[PDB]
Amino acid sequence: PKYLKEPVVVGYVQRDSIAQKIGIKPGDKIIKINGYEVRTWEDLRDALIRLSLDGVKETTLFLERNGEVLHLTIKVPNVQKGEELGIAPLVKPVVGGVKKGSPADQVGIKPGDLILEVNGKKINTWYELVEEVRKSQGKAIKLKILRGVAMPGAEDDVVMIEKELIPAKDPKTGTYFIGLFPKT
Amino acid sequence: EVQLVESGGGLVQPGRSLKLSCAASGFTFSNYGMAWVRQTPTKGLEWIASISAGGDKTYYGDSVKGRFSISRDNAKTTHYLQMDSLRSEDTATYYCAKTSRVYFDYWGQGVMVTVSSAETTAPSVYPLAPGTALKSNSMVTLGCLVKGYFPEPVTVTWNSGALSSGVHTFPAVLQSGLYTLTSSVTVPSSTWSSQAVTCNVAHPASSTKVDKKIVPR
Amino acid sequence: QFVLTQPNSVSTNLGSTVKLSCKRSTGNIGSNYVNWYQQHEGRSPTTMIYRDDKRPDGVPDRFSGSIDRSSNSALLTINNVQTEDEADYFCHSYSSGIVFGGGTKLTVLGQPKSTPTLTVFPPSTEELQGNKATLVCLISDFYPSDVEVAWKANGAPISQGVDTANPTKQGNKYIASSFLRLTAEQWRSRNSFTCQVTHEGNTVEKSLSPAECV
């Protein structure tokens, strides 16, 4: 599971959770709890376990929010009794599948594609993609896409595929769709 | 054909009473003794009570002598087991059986009796349709989540028994005093596209029946 | 006035002949008749053998009863054993009381091997309305009956809120089910959950996701 080796940038934050109540935000990068150096999700997993075994009830948490290091006091969750912080890794907005004949198929979106931007705005998560797509209703949607591996030396070139597609209304439900399935 | 059908089970508190009924047919009722035999997972099959053919002699297992009373009504081709002063341990499946001098020749379906101070909880029934993907299969499997009931059992049919094959009711899990189970049915995708598919969940103890139609999500 | 002792469990190969014994503790086995009842899982007993060795109509001739005076035991012999012989077998006798043996569950080995079919189901919207999410995993059509069920979240082991039912025989095959109890929020917070079944060393799995097609 690739996420355990990734840095801890908060994706989803559960409503009425320890992380929410103490003001953790999507985007925050967790760098320290009590202590333990937290570079990766594995660290944080392994740390919370240890803290909870050591009966630590409250401790100090360090994150980066806009590259500024904030200090917070966080209830350590009882891992045994089934508690959790309520934070989840980023879901990178990658197309898992494309519906045959759908607007997205028509303009040639392909599984493996990574949506960078929607109608000019940058996105980092599938959830954001779905937000921006729904709110534009029936109006044309512009997508900036990163496709495939770059040529060595060219990974950081500023050039993207730009696609424009018009949502379709399902004849049964009357629901707008573009025909993108998430990577799973 | 010999048939024996019990009723009258359910949940009761320790100290309370309950009366079981067994309706007989397909043989000369008054010609045979009747009996009750119960079963737990722990203690296997256990004889509890017998009544002679003419109703004038009765016999009881050690654990129920004095608390249970067996009687028959030849006119109704029915026999009964009145149970008083019930205890945890009387929780069991109760079978009626017909005798043939030296053995039990035929048995009922069994009814479940639970002696508990815990309260009857009717299930929530939730429809289970598959999540959408790209590809659609020839066949489709639809489900029926039967959640947090007490006590056992439940029964699930599909379209009132019209869907019989491809039906699996999966035995329940027990968590914090409540049972959960699922029933599945596998139908051609074409059946689901055209006809309605409805699970029917009965819970005898709570006297509830729930129909729930499965729709695409 | 006596007990009847049966082994709690006996195993035999498909097609084999097997003997199930039933020993009277006190007094002669021959003194009163012994009868034998077969009970399948969650069904009623049916009579297999009455009066020591007599078989009802409809009962296959593969079942025979006998009495061995020198072991004070009754024997139920099943020949050319079949899948559907997997059941509990209870011997029965009487004198002043009515006595059942503890019952012998028969395991039939060497049936055709079969990999489990997985069906997974996401939480219903009705359930989600009430802020709860049960993920369902149905495991069917497998043999042998031993499986190991494990849940993943974002591909990492999860044990909290898992409830698995032991495999049971329904048709000519085994079924089991597993549930993962979540809140709505725990459900929504993940990319994937996985139901993973391991059977005779081979692993099969299916995943669920709150992530929406669009």
Side-chain angles (χ1 to χ4, degrees), chain A residues 1-33 35-184, chain B, chain C residues 2-214:
Chain A
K2 292 163 299 150
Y3 88 88
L4 287 170
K5 308 291 189 193
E6 267 183 311
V8 186
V9 194
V10 170
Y12 198 93
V13 167
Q14 305 175 36
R15 180 178 188 5
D16 297 336
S17 70
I18 285 165
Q20 208 219 237
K21 282 194 216 303
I22 68 101
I24 296 281
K25 300 288 187 176
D28 292 354
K29 186 195 171 176
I30 287 151
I31 56 163
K32 189 171 196 168
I33 196 166
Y36 298 93
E37 194 70 32
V38 164
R39 274 124 67 264
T40 73
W41 279 96
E42 189 193 337
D43 293 336
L44 179 51
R45 185 260 280 94
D46 275 346
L48 290 168
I49 283 172
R50 194 93 220 292
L51 283 177
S52 196
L53 271 181
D54 282 5
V56 171
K57 280 218 149 167
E58 289 202 14
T59 191
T60 191
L61 175 114
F62 294 105
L63 59 81
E64 279 175 6
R65 185 193 309 196
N66 309 332
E68 51 146 17
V69 178
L70 257 82
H71 56 318
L72 254 166
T73 305
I74 194 157
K75 180 83 207 276
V76 172
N78 196 329
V79 295
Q80 190 216 138
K81 171 161 64 185
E83 290 183 358
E84 52 183 346
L85 280 180
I87 52 150
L90 288 176
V91 179
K92 212 67 207 160
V94 177
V95 175
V98 165
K99 189 194 165 182
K100 253 289 156 215
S102 76
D105 191 31
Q106 290 164 36
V107 297
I109 294 161
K110 299 229 175 188
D113 282 6
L114 166 64
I115 320 301
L116 285 168
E117 293 190 14
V118 183
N119 294 333
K121 215 202 193 187
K122 308 197 194 213
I123 58 161
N124 332 287
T125 75
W126 185 268
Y127 298 92
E128 288 180 27
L129 168 67
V130 175
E131 274 189 337
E132 311 310 325
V133 169
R134 275 177 186 168
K135 78 188 289 197
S136 67
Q137 199 88 57
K139 291 222 298 318
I141 294 164
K142 286 183 173 167
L143 296 179
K144 291 187 158 143
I145 290 162
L146 188 135
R147 180 177 284 161
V149 298
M151 189 175 67
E155 322 92 46
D156 299 317
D157 288 357
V158 167
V159 67
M160 296 136 289
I161 296 177
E162 285 139 39
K163 288 293 176 61
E164 172 172 336
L165 67 164
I166 306 191
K169 182 174 276 199
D170 184 307
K172 254 58 150 171
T173 59
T175 296
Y176 286 121
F177 74 94
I178 58 172
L180 296 187
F181 288 75
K183 192 213 251 293
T184 317
Chain B
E1 203 202 23
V2 179
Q3 284 227 303
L4 303 162
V5 176
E6 305 104 313
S7 35
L11 182 159
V12 286
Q13 306 194 62
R16 304 305 176 83
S17 290
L18 203 57
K19 181 169 201 189
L20 299 182
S21 291
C22 178
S25 72
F27 64 94
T28 300
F29 183 68
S30 56
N31 270 354
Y32 300 102
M34 294 310 275
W36 292 86
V37 173
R38 80 190 172 178
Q39 166 180 78
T40 49
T42 30
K43 288 156 281 159
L45 290 170
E46 193 194 330
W47 169 75
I48 51 166
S50 282
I51 185 157
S52 56
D56 65 298
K57 279 154 287 154
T58 65
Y59 308 81
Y60 299 98
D62 292 335
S63 64
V64 299
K65 202 174 302 197
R67 288 188 303 125
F68 290 20
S69 48
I70 184 180
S71 62
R72 66 193 298 158
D73 170 344
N74 287 6
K76 298 194 186 203
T77 60
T78 294
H79 69 103
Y80 308 86
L81 183 78
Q82 180 63 57
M83 306 164 74
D84 303 326
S85 309
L86 278 158
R87 326 150 171 188
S88 298
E89 318 93 57
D90 302 308
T91 301
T93 297
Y94 286 75
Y95 297 99
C96 63
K98 173 194 171 311
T99 64
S100 189
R101 201 167 186 279
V102 289
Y103 71 108
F104 307 105
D105 63 342
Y106 289 93
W107 302 72
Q109 288 83 50
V111 283
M112 294 196 197
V113 173
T114 305
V115 189
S116 170
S117 70
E119 51 182 30
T120 300
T121 313
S124 314
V125 186
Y126 300 116
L128 312 170
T132 344
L134 285 179
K135 197 253 204 179
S136 200
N137 198 49
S138 180
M139 297 288 266
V140 70
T141 300
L142 304 177
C144 186
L145 179 51
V146 183
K147 188 200 184 187
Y149 61 93
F150 183 81
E152 282 271 46
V154 291
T155 61
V156 181
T157 60
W158 287 89
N159 294 2
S160 312
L163 301 172
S164 50
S165 64
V167 169
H168 293 301
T169 305
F170 292 77
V173 286
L174 172 57
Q175 209 282 126
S176 297
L178 298 178
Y179 293 92
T180 285
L181 68 71
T182 298
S183 183
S184 72
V185 66
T186 303
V187 298
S189 169
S190 77
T191 311
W192 193 36
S193 61
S194 67
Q195 301 169 41
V197 182
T198 296
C199 74
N200 325 116
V201 184
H203 183 242
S206 69
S207 280
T208 63
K209 262 156 281 205
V210 171
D211 297 357
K212 193 81 60 162
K213 194 193 160 182
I214 327 294
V215 303
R217 64 192 273 120
Chain C
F2 60 89
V3 303
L4 292 169
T5 306
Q6 285 182 277
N8 71 282
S9 189
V10 174
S11 56
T12 204
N13 289 309
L14 182 64
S16 75
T17 296
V18 69
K19 293 174 292 164
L20 308 184
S21 66
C22 168
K23 179 164 162 167
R24 180 153 172 174
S25 61
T26 184
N28 292 336
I29 193 77
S31 303
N32 312 84
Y33 290 107
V34 178
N35 319 280
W36 288 93
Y37 309 100
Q38 178 193 69
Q39 183 185 37
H40 287 109
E41 205 151 19
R43 307 278 299 285
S44 287
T46 60
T47 307
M48 292 292 98
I49 292 295
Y50 64 99
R51 290 210 237 111
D52 293 349
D53 60 20
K54 298 176 164 284
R55 191 167 48 258
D57 268 279
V59 171
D61 68 358
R62 295 187 295 106
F63 294 80
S64 58
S66 66
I67 302 296
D68 166 24
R69 301 206 146 59
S70 74
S71 65
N72 213 42
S73 297
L75 306 178
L76 175 69
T77 298
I78 323 172
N79 72 68
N80 305 245
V81 157
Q82 315 267 109
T83 279
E84 66 267 357
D85 302 333
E86 283 185 318
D88 261 69
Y89 296 89
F90 298 88
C91 63
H92 156 249
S93 202
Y94 59 90
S95 53
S96 53
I98 295 166
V99 183
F100 288 101
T104 299
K105 160 59 173 144
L106 181 63
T107 294
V108 178
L109 299 172
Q111 307 181 53
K113 278 149 148 51
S114 197
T115 304
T117 312
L118 259 46
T119 308
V120 290
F121 288 115
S124 67
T125 69
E126 291 96 322
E127 199 197 2
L128 276 185
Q129 163 180 93
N131 273 289
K132 301 207 161 192
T134 306
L135 316 192
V136 177
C137 187
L138 303 179
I139 321 164
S140 70
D141 192 57
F142 57 90
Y143 182 93
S145 80
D146 276 284
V147 290
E148 290 287 306
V149 183
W151 282 92
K152 311 301 192 186
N154 291 334
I158 178 158
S159 66
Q160 190 62 33
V162 172
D163 283 286
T164 307
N166 298 309
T168 67
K169 205 186 188 177
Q170 188 153 85
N172 86 101
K173 233 100 184 198
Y174 292 90
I175 57 168
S177 60
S178 194
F179 304 97
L180 172 57
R181 283 181 288 94
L182 295 177
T183 66
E185 279 308 290
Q186 297 170 310
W187 159 243
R188 287 184 196 109
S189 69
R190 265 61 165 244
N191 195 48
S192 69
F193 299 91
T194 296
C195 183
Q196 164 180 292
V197 178
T198 302
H199 184 252
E200 293 231 289
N202 314 134
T203 287
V204 170
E205 61 184 37
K206 279 182 187 194
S207 298
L208 299 153
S209 178
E212 310 184 71
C213 65
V214 70

